[PDB]
Design a protein around this ligand. Structure first.
Ligand SMILES: Nc1ncnc2c1ncn2[C@@H]1O[C@H](COP(=O)(O)OP(=O)(O)OP(=O)(O)O)[C@@H](O)[C@H]1O
Ligand SMILES: Nc1ncnc2c1ncn2[C@@H]1O[C@H](COP(=O)(O)OP(=O)(O)OP(=O)(O)O)[C@@H](O)[C@H]1O
Ligand SMILES: Nc1ncnc2c1ncn2[C@@H]1O[C@H](COP(=O)(O)OP(=O)(O)OP(=O)(O)O)[C@@H](O)[C@H]1O
Ligand SMILES: Nc1ncnc2c1ncn2[C@@H]1O[C@H](COP(=O)(O)OP(=O)(O)OP(=O)(O)O)[C@@H](O)[C@H]1O
Ligand SMILES: Nc1ncnc2c1ncn2[C@@H]1O[C@H](COP(=O)(O)OP(=O)(O)OP(=O)(O)O)[C@@H](O)[C@H]1O
Ligand SMILES: Nc1ncnc2c1ncn2[C@@H]1O[C@H](COP(=O)(O)OP(=O)(O)OP(=O)(O)O)[C@@H](O)[C@H]1O
Ligand code: MOO
Ligand code: MOO
Ligand code: MOO
Ligand SMILES: [Mg+2]
Ligand SMILES: [Mg+2]
Ligand SMILES: [Mg+2]
Lengths: 268, 244, 244, 268, 244, 268
């Protein structure tokens, strides 16, 4: 390869051209925020539960940002499900529902951000405005709404009008495109089980699994949005994710310290 | 299936490489668009063309990831849109930003016969990984919008007659055969370059309304006009949405 | 008294709890709005409904002050507005943001027959203290706007026939008597729940133009149409502005 | 009370329902910026006077932010009065005048902010973007325009078209909703007097007074916008305010140090 | 030379000091503008007037540089625009922000017969140095826009009959002689005050389309109407663009 | 002079009145960011060259902000020339081309900003949002797009439709209006020569020159946009500029250290 050959292809071929695609794949790989960790705080699993769930995680965030740069994205939760149900019953398309869901994740970011404001932690659009916060020991963290910006250009699912890329996908893609070192999904279960632990009696805990193994076990759409598992196999920078129970005091702190709490899902 | 938000809308995507040809291509296209304004309600969306290749060259040399390159390319499509809208300003046509297209298109098409916007979708730093080239580009964004709206059609205005079996301007030029009609699924099973995003074929597979998209040569005056009347003057791409 | 900015305007506030009923309520209302577009120039403003109760539940559990809860509720009214506007998009109707309603409503109603916006006012973190529930909600914002504009009317579209002497869906349901007509001052002197914000009564006391606001049942097709023609089909609230 | 009963009422009653209102009143009370002080810099009383008034207060702000977190809001002043007079003579309503007045407070914030820029102090929308500035010893202060955001939804006064909620009210409501520890109005008089000291010969200084006492003395609309006194009696967090003379060197500094300069007005 | 973007547009600049006179001047001007709406497609741009002098007084006392004073003055022109648009709201007229004027004017003039904007250009902190008073003010911004658009005209609406050889309200009032016609180059060679920005003369020298700008007394009803029909009722300024 | 006489003139004369103009010229002179240096990173000369040019300058920026407050503006380069050529061939006016060129400088600021994000350095509108960054040792620098905001109100050149005020002018005017101590243009030549060193064989290096001397030598439109030289002679605060070769490792660092690398162009 060479820059000259890449620029030649870039000028003279369609971007669809396999030869161009391959030359572009050999480009150097810059990580924009390599030392940051992206954390998703679940909407339904955490923020909808109010103080008993949110206040301990606020404390952990405040303690953790002493030693860890944090990009904290919020899920949407039950109010988004309500909007999806109204809009779906009207026949509205996935692109319209996508905008509705974003407003609920924004609400959750605003509530979490107000609990963190006195600790110096702002609510921002995304990682592109986190540069100053993440360079300051006094700050070292930001809060953002986790919904992707696709709005009316949301790709629909194969079936139904529920946007397939929601806040798990939004947070994952931010960690991936900013080349972050770690992606932690904070939910309300200890991790992945062989069945939904809420509706199954004897589901077995899975500490570590690959995407292929999840698909083969029927877990494609279990504790993460299924599109996320496919994004993870495509990712250049974040090749595994960790799912932890935010309802367990200190679980996020211990995950940031490298403890294998929860479930590690690997691209391969 | 979802209702059609704007069933009377016609969406026209103007290739960035058509715009790249400057006045020689743009002025005839502007005159044709002018004559179309009393006939159709148009959302005219521009692609990016060669300047996005240049910013890809720089950004890839700098090592930037695909989510960094996506808004850089989208900027070029927006610039093409501003240029094209300026040429139609005396007809009441203006460029409208993405949030305006997303939420206020109905009122803007009530105010005037056509608006121009960027065909790129606002995937921004949430573009999908895998390729170092942003996959969701101008064809893809235009189709996503046209299908989301339930528009009466999407016409893709190219600098070639349509889709060939090989790049008609590339090394295998000699064996390039014109395809008057194809399905998205057939195109998706083929390797090799296309005049349309590969992601266009993917979003056609999940489409809810648009049954066919015609790729026509905007360098031939009259083909866009004919295509908007359903005349077969380029390559018809069947999306796999079935008619009633 | 101040001039009337938009004397020909009709303002219609759609209760969030009407929207909460989904297609069963929204589709008939959309069809009725469709038929009204050629008859009136409409500013259609949506309330918040049950989702704002949920975010109040969470926010109050988190201890958040009333100025934090106000924009959280307003968001829900905006979402209802986006939903309703989408259903009217094929008629040229779009949702317009608060700054647009505030400064550019005249041009938007020149472009199209109706626009949709959020009925909540942008009090934001400057909501008044006292109650832990934001006082200036959808009824109040819609009235403030309608009166500021000097609009020809404000019609409040409810999920009940109008105002009763008790909550007709609550514990004292049995003694709830319908009020065909009342004054804001009479309502303000009563304790007990209302289908309209208490702050609506306060802003009616300082009103400059709107003499009466009718609360009608949007679940009964035709009542909104009748109300916009001044027919008495719900509860008339006299504001205490006197006619000439 | 209980969260479950509150959520029951929230779902099943009108928000107007006294039972719901009462249950909501028992909710816990979070202060968002409990350690910050809100300071209003008068438009007519200070900024309109130019350098002789503004430069000493700039020095005090710079010195004070070493030990105090500051949210500094600007008044509007004579250009807003001019706009109000033009618009009122045209018959325009209070909601239109409200937007006009905001632009003048914005001008004043921009001028003050440019004098503070080299000291690290930004101009922001309001307290919702002050999180990062107020966590930094190098910054520890922000400047904002003091006008409330009500715009066309301004509630009119009982009489006339002058917006009744202007920059005193805007700053007070920000201190109140962010749960700040202190609200200082910086004007051009030592404090409250028994009569307007500019137009009265022998007005007597009042070091401390309640809102009820002010109303009973005819001072309802004296050194603060009268709506502010009613807001103060309704406030959950800021139950007194201090009015000081910004034209006296060091008066703001001494007020921040707990000195009883000026007049303390108490909700009760 | 560049094409004309909006050749059918008429641009009218309303002096801030005209607005400063309040209802006595504004109400007749509003009635005249009302009657003009069916005759012309109008971009109505307001200057700043006396409030910008006050903020200059404060800002200069504070030592602020000219790039700080420029947006402070522009704010006042925007406020005048909001006031004037409010008076025309019942005719469908609204104030539009600078980015809207720059990119979407065509669609807004398709929606309604006239819009109002600020005549100041958005030079902001990039105003040129030299003078401590922002040079590119309301006359200059209005001309830059009118000429950029290739508008059919720019009419400047003053509180005096036109340009005199001395300030007709100043110390040399007595020797002030009215100039029915002048060239920008002649005005630029003179020292002494003018009713128009000196920078207006500079941008007239590089103009591409506007051949003449008339300064007329907006305090005399009918002069704006006559000026928009090309009748000579004030001072004609020839820009030095030559006709074909 | 006096404030009272200035305010008298301000109220009663046209702003065109020479007497008013002269009284305004005697006003005090406040420098908003007196300790900051504005650096322009060339679009065509640096950023268009990709990694070999940009990466060493990134390193220098990171090292330099340890001891220097930096406002770093980006040029536009070849994509703007391409847009200018398309638009000019359509007969579009300079005001339309101005908006097109701004988007290219924005792209360049975004690329540079992403390389600096992990070092804490944000991309901002301009100097008016640099207050917090420039007060922090951890930050002490911002990146901005260098194009002036004139858009459709761009003054055209005497001839042709190329906007005459582009990113050299935009950066210079920012340094000037914020009263910065230093303006450094980072290009791809060691400085000014007696002829274009790319197209001339024996051009001679010029270490120091005034604007008048440049004009007299035929160099009016050589290594800087010619409007910049006129702006420089009008400037109140930045009365000289330095042009340096960003392709020479350490050249920017040495220029910040006071070394006379490159060419110093003086207003007089
Ligand atoms: N096999 C499984 N193992 C673990 N959890 C599972 C499994 N299958 C389903 N789940 C469910 O997935 C849920 C987590 O998804 P949920 O949507 O609640 O998270 P969230 O991130 O809070 O969503 P949002 O943020 O969109 O509100 C768990 O509560 C659990 O009930
Ligand atoms: N199979 C094919 N059939 C037709 N054209 C092809 C094919 N493969 C490659 N091409 C090339 O694609 C070119 C069009 O390029 P491209 O699609 O990138 O431009 P565009 O659509 O104008 O740009 P944008 O996507 O930015 O709007 C054609 O001129 C042709 O050379
Ligand atoms: N005196 C009363 N008369 C009529 N309805 C009442 C009364 N008191 C309480 N209500 C209740 O108010 C309900 C309507 O609720 P509410 O006014 O909150 O909804 P909305 O107006 O749709 O919501 P939003 O204010 O968010 O637009 C009625 O269905 C009724 O149960
Ligand atoms: N009883 C009183 N005691 C003290 N001051 C009084 C009294 N009555 C009236 N005032 C007047 O109130 C004025 C302060 O209000 P003013 O509007 O000037 O303050 P401001 O905050 O600068 O206003 P803005 O910020 O809106 O310009 C004082 O200058 C004083 O003349
Ligand atoms: N040579 C002149 N001929 C005519 N008027 C002059 C002349 N020199 C000064 N003036 C003064 O200019 C005044 C108009 O002032 P000015 O041009 O500042 O107001 P404006 O155009 O309304 O304001 P803005 O520029 O903010 O829109 C006239 O009333 C007159 O006193
Ligand atoms: N006499 C001269 N001395 C030095 N350089 C000259 C001279 N005359 C012309 N130049 C040219 O000026 C060029 C610098 O201008 P150029 O537009 O490339 O800089 P830039 O700041 O990168 O532009 P942009 O940022 O707008 O892309 C040099 O590459 C050089 O070829
Ligand atoms: O962009 Mo527009 O033209 O009224 O919302
Ligand atoms: O929001 Mo808009 O301002 O439809 O032209
Ligand atoms: O400002 Mo607007 O863009 O009336 O449609
Ligand atoms: Mg193509
Ligand atoms: Mg109600
Ligand atoms: Mg004038």
């Amino acid at each position: 390869n060479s820059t000259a050959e890449l620029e030649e292809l870039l000028m003279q071929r369609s971007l669809t051209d396999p030869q161009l695609q391959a030359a572009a794949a050999a480009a150097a790989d810059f990580r924009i925020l390599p030392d940051a960790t992206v954390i998703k705080i679940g909407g339904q699993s955490v923020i909808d539960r109010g103080r008993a769930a949110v206040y301990p995680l606020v404390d952990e965030i405040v303690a953790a940002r002493k030693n860890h740069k944090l990009l904290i994205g919020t899920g949407a939760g039950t109010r988004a499900r309500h909007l999806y149900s109204i809009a779906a019953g009207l026949g509205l398309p996935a692109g319209v529902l996508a905008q509705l869901g974003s407003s609920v994740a924004d609400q959750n970011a605003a509530m979490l951000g107000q609990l963190l404001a006195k600790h110096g932690i702002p609510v921002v659009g995304g990682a592109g405005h986190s540069a100053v916060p993440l360079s300051l020991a006094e700050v070292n963290a930001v809060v953002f709404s986790g919904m992707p910006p696709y709005k009316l250009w949301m790709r629909p699912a194969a079936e139904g009008v529920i946007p397939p890329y929601r806040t798990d996908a939004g947070c994952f893609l931010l960690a991936e495109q900013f080349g972050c070192k770690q992606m932690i999904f904070v939910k309300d279960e200890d991790g992945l089980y062989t069945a939904n632990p809420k509706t199954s009696k004897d589901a077995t805990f899975i500490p570590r699994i690959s995407v292929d193994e999840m698909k083969a076990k029927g877990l494609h759409d279990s504790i993460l949005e299924f599109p996320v598992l496919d994004l993870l196999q495509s990712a250049q920078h974040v090749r595994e994710v960790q799912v932890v129970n935010g309802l367990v005091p200190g679980n996020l702190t211990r995950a940031l310290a490298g403890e294998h709490v929860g479930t590690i899902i690997t691209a391969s | 299936r979802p209702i059609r938000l704007l069933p009377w809308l016609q969406v026209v995507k103007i290739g960035g490489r058509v715009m790249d040809r400057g006045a020689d291509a743009i002025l005839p296209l502007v005159e044709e668009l002018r004559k179309l304004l009393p006939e159709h309600r148009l959302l005219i969306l521009t692609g990016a063309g060669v300047r996005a290749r240049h910013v890809f060259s720089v950004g890839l040399d700098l090592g930037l990831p695909v989510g960094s390159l996506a808004p850089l390319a989208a900027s070029e499509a927006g610039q093409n849109g501003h240029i094209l809208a300026a040429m139609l300003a005396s007809e009441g046509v203006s460029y409208v930003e993405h949030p305006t297209v997303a939420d206020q298109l109905a009122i803007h098409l009530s105010a005037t016969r056509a608006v121009v916007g960027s065909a790129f979708p606002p995937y921004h730093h949430h573009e999908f990984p895998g390729s170092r080239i942003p996959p969701h580009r101008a064809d893809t964004g235009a189709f996503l919008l046209a299908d989301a709206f339930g528009a009466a059609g999407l016409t893709i205005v190219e600098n070639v007659d349509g889709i060939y079996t090989a790049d008609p301007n590339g090394p295998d030029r000699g064996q390039a055969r014109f395809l008057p009609e194809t399905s998205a699924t057939d195109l998706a099973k083929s390797e090799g370059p296309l005049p349309v995003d590969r992601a266009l074929l993917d979003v056609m597979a999940t489409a809810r309304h648009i049954e066919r998209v015609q790729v026509v040569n905007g360098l031939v005056p009259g083909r866009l006009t004919a295509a908007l009347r359903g005349e077969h003057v380029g390559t018809l791409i069947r999306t796999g949405v079935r008619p009633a």
